[PDB]
RNA sequence: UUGACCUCAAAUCAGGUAGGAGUACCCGCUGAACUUAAGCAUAUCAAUAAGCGGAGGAAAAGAAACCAACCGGGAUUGCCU
RNA sequence: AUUGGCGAGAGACCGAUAGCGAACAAGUACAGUGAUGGAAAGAUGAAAAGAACUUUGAAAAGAGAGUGAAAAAGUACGUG
RNA sequence: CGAAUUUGGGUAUAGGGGCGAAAGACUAAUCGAACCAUCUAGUAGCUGGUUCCUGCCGAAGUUUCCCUCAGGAUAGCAGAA
RNA sequence: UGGAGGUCAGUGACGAAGCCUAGACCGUAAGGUCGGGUCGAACGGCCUCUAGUGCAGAUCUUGGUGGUAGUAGCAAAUAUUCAAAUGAGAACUUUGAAGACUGAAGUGGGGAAAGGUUCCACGUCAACAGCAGUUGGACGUGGGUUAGUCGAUCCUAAGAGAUGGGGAAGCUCCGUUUCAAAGGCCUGAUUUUAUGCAGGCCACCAUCGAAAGGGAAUCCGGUUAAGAUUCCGGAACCUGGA
RNA sequence: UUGUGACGGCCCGUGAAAAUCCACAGGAAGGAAUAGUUUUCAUGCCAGGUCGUACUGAUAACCGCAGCAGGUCUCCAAGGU
RNA sequence: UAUCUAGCGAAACCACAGCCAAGGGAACGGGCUUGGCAGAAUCAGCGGGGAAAGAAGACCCUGUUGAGCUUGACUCUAGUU
RNA sequence: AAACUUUCAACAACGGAUCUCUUGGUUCUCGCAUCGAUGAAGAACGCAGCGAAAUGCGAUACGUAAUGUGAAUUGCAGAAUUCCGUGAAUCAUCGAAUCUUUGAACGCACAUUGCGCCCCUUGGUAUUCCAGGGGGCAUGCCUGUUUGAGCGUCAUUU
């Protein structure tokens, strides 16, 4: 049949983790991401896709360097101490 | 038995143990507990006791 | 209670590798106690007391090279200014403000006159 | 409705030539100096079986007459053509069974 | 002309769009040119270009680029404006001379349609403008 | 698989890492309304598939 | 024999710049169909949705190869009409 | 111009099946190879003062107590 | 049941496309055109539902036209002012 | 009915809203008011304004709950029994004694993919193991994976894929040696220099692609709660260097 | 049972590449009584980094919603009839 | 196995429910009218009935609803000449 | 007049409706202009005395430096002689730093924690071999420097 001794065969992987995004979404035979577009220089991205766009927009990690620069440009970008 | 990081190789920790406890090693072997935290056994030569050393060092 | 950043500025440069050496050593000896023993935030104290020797000395050493590159041009990237990207590609305020000769010489001979109205 | 087994085989994903166990392209030896001034020498070594073609191929070795080293040659073998075999190729060679006149 | 990039030349729709062979680019080859110059030369700046040369296949067009980087161009006031960063592409957005007129940015009763931008001047005659206290 | 990568060791090593129950003295700490571990995972109930 | 000029190269040469993120707005390219026509093909939806390239705090436009036909007005933009 | 970013002031708006999907460890748990899909889930009490102690039971718990204005507020807690 | 054999792994072929010793078969339980998101709250003369009370008045299934015959307009019947 | 502007200087912790009540009164009715219980913080009448304003249905949405009903059923894979121990409690745990089966293309001993700690020890039965459980692949806490020789790493196959270059408005496409100026190691001059040098030759003309192809080299014995061709003891070998 | 060897049969089917390692042609250069030629003879010295390694591998550790009579590649294989 | 026990324990379906004969009725009633009758609670079977359950009949018709395919339908189109 | 439906001056259940509340959303208005090769946004690992998640951070790792305030943090411990002070703080501000592996991601590759080359330093009786520490090596373009190639072409004889 087309179900339990088909699901039973399947067990290759034809997707793993991408460097870019870790979410096992990297087509190892494509070599590419099915996520994220690794490796090509754009993150995947689309209109249609507002869902996907607001999973993976700015805001939804750390912010390391902007959630800053709001600050030091409230200051005036100064030097010194 | 040593806790080690992942960047270490057995080289460093050679060096790194003949510095700190001024003992001559005669094998170091490594593994990556699963934890993911590198493990050391370096085994000194015969003219130094490891538990000598241990005890030096606090645990006994 | 934790070493204090302005005797570590006073400090010289091999008493604070001294010092950083034997703050590893301890660190190295109070972690063999935490492992032995349930609790104890002497290890958090030492930690902080590393970090404060490791940044005296990295503000002395970006001081002195500073020093170095003081008074000429191409200073290493680390040590000019981080403004913005945009703002460091933007005009100089002497390249916004240079006008040509026949500018200078309109505005010079035409300024904006201060007239009022009253009577 | 639907495109057709031959223009499948045009775009060719599957419907390329299997081409593994083959020997090699089958090609008369260039048209430099010697074959047209006048003939070189070469020695059929090998007679083999090329796969998907039908017909023997052979092995020749030439001289390089501008640098000292064997230039090797795949050409389809002839009827009669044996192995360790003197053929001739060039405008000035022999009428014989395997030159390249 | 601009073959449309269809396979086998079907659209799905209507036969005004599933017409394709002889569509044209609303853009002029002066146009295209200046903007591969520009992504090859990113970081300049293009000011102009003009046609020099041209074949049955080919037309060959020479465009000027300028530094903005470069210390003279910072200096000599009379091209910091293209120094200035709101200048970035100038080709890609259509601000050079044949994208101005390929905008078809020209005063008169004959640019009714693109005289602010196309897009611009369509929206601002098809919003709904409702008022406080209707009028 | 027993023949692994150094990065699906480390996820693994992660993994088992995460995967403990909650202490109890964040249940005492107060304005907290965390009680278990929501996150918590078994091999046989759910597979990380990485 | 030795110097140039032009064109084209090579350098982990000296110094710079571009990429990418981001769509709420802006400048373009490309571009449908559902739908309406009580059917449907022009038409409509729509010079829109999707796709692509490119900026700024606004962008674009902008000081007439303009509008006019009047006793003429006088860059551009926006609102009422 | 302004459904983005930063800061601020409001409303004849909604009030936990409503209002953004998300008032809560919410783009989380979870599903799919993948594109992607995507929840549920607020309230003890002013204050834990969160039930010491005795007894039955192997224990969970029960009975009696005790705290509390209320235990017709006892984790399974506003009303129910 | 020694082979046009069986099979793991790595590869290539992607949707009006692929692949098919050909059954419209197979293409991730989906195939006479996969799946995902958006256009899209697509359109529906066609079904189903359409939430308090009382009082007063109170019908039509007929005329004409319509790709009109399960529908509309029109006139007629009815209410209100 | 939810909100808003006025007024009742309206009701209320001496109890508002809400909910229950074969208790009462009023209206033809939509409903309103009150009596009695529970409850603890807001709420109402009148004149107006306003709307996301009234449910019995839509194989309506979400959630919850019934009869069926202690019902169908828990019947494939030959099969269990006696005693003891532990335990509150044993058909199911452990030990012993029997009886059996798999019967070496095994119900044995390892591995690949996959899983990811499920391995092991000690506590331990609230939930899961569609009966039970003292047991467990369950829960809690910890321990465990040691390599020059085994693999990866190296090579290339089918194929993938930058560069030069050419298309495309463009995301990107073709192309892999083609219409490219495509380039690194040896006795080395022996001392301030220096893969600049009195010197030398070429022609694969990126890279990726196999834990089953190719391939440098380790075996025995012992050892643990768990690791061993990896640890220990002995005995070897290969590569690189000196 | 496995391996090996010398062989025979089969094909219009004749049953990868490359890395890597040797050897052979040729004679460049160098070499002589305490001084030179051999580290492809023997012995002697040092080092050999990084990641995986536990366990199941299936009527309970994988997939099939599960501790599902399903599916899932392979090595060793005693005695009697 | 069913059956009876100990433990465990669903689902389909359900306007309300469940005895007939005739009548009339939307022309085949469990309910309405006339008559026959009619006594708790139940167990195992059983397959006459519940026009039993499973699914907004797939046969047929309508729709100014499609789609697969064909062609000498209408209008176009890649390619080619 | 037993067991088996209806209703409670009645409780107890199941369940989470109503009511009341709201550090939340949704709309309106106003002000401002600030990402990234000086390496962004986003990932992956790790960092707390007791942390799994969330917050923050990067081996200086729930943070270091500077400034301000002034005596805390608190779930439990821990140094309260720091508490008339160059000084607590899960404080605020924020200008100096640190910033692991990545990522436009940059030595080549990447289902490798794979494989190189250059410079300096140290060790192994070593310029070549190995190891350790530090600094580097992407591409497309612009200006300039040096080295070049082309009977492309001038000055036109040993």
Redesign the pocket.
């Known amino acids: ?26 087509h ?4 590419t991401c ?48 | ?1 040593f806790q080690v ?11 790194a143990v003949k510095e700190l406890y001024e003992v001559d090693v ?14 050391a ?1 370096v ?1 000194l030569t015969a003219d130094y006791d490891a538990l000598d050393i241990a005890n030096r060092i606090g645990y006994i | ?2 070493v ?4 570590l500025r006073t400090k010289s440069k091999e008493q604070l590798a001294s010092q950083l050496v034997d703050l590893k050593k301890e660190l190295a000896e109070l972690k063999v106690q ?1 492992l032995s023993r ?8 030492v ?2 007391s ?3 020797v ?6 002395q050493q ?1 001081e002195a090279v ?1 020093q170095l590159y003081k008074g000429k041009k ?1 200073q290493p ?13 933007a005009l100089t305020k002497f390249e916004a403000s240079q006008v040509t000769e026949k500018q200078r010489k309109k505005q010079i001979a035409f300024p904006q006159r201060k007239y009022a109205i009253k009577a | ?5 031959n ?2 085989k045009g ?6 030539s299997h ?3 083959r020997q090699g392209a089958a090609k008369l030896r260039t048209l430099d100096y010697a074959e047209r001034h006048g003939y070189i020498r070469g020695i059929v070594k090998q007679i ?2 090329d ?2 073609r ?1 017909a023997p191929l052979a092995k020749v070795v030439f001289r390089d007459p501008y ?1 000292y ?1 064997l230039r090797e040659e795949i050409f389809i073998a002839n009827e009669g053509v044996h192995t360790g075999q003197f053929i001739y190729a060039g405008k000035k060679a022999s009428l014989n069974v395997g030159n390249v006149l | 002309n ?26 002029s080859l002066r146009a ?1 040119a200046e ?2 110059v520009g ?6 700046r293009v000011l102009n270009s003009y046609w020099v040369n041209q074949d049955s ?2 037309k060959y067009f020479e465009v000027i ?1 300028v ?4 210390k003279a161009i910072r200096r000599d006031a009379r091209y910091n404006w293209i120094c200035d ?6 080709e ?4 050079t001379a044949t ?2 007129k ?9 640019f009714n ?12 005659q ?2 709904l ?1 409702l ?1 406080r206290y209707r ?1 | ?23 109890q ?2 249940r ?23």
């Not at chain 5, 960063?85 to 100038?90: D, E, G, I, S, T």
């Not at chain 5, 390929?102 to 004959?110: E, F, T, V």
């Open positions: 049949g087309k179900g339990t001794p088909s699901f039973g065969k399947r067990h290759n992987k034809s997707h793993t983790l991408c460097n870019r995004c870790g979410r096992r979404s990297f190892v035979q494509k070599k099915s996520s994220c577009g690794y490796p090509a220089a754009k993150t995947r991205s689309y209109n249609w896709g507002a869902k996907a766009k607001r999973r993976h927009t700015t805001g939804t990690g750390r912010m390391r360097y902007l959630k800053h620069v709001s600050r030091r440009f409230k200051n005036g970008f100064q030097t010194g101490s | 038995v990081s992942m960047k270490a190789n057995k080289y460093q920790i050679k060096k005669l094998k170091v072997n490594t593994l990556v507990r699963p934890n993911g935290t590198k493990k056994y085994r | 209670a934790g204090k950043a302005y005797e935490k349930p609790s104890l935030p002497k290890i958090k104290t930690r902080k590393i970090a404060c490791l940044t005296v000395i990295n503000e970006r500073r191409y990237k680390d040590l000019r200014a981080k403004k913005t990207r945009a703002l460091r590609r | 409705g639907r495109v057709i087994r223009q499948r775009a060719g994903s599957i419907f390329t081409t593994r166990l083999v079986h796969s998907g039908g640098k080293r | 601009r073959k449309r990039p269809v396979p086998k030349g079907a659209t799905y729709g209507k036969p005004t769009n599933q017409g394709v062979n002889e569509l044209k680019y609303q853009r295209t903007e591969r992504r090859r030369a990113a970081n300049l296949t080919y680029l530094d903005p980087q470069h960063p709101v200048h970035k592409h100038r890609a957005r259509g601000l994208g101005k390929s905008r078809g940015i020209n005063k008169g009763h004959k349609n693109t005289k602010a931008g196309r897009r611009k001047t369509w929206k601002r098809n919003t403008s008022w009028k | 698989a027993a023949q692994k990568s150094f990065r699906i060791k480390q996820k693994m090593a992660k993994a088992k890492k995460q995967n403990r129950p909650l202490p003295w964040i005492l700490r107060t304005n907290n309304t965390i009680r278990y571990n929501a996150k918590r995972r078994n091999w046989r109930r759910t597979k990380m598939n990485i």
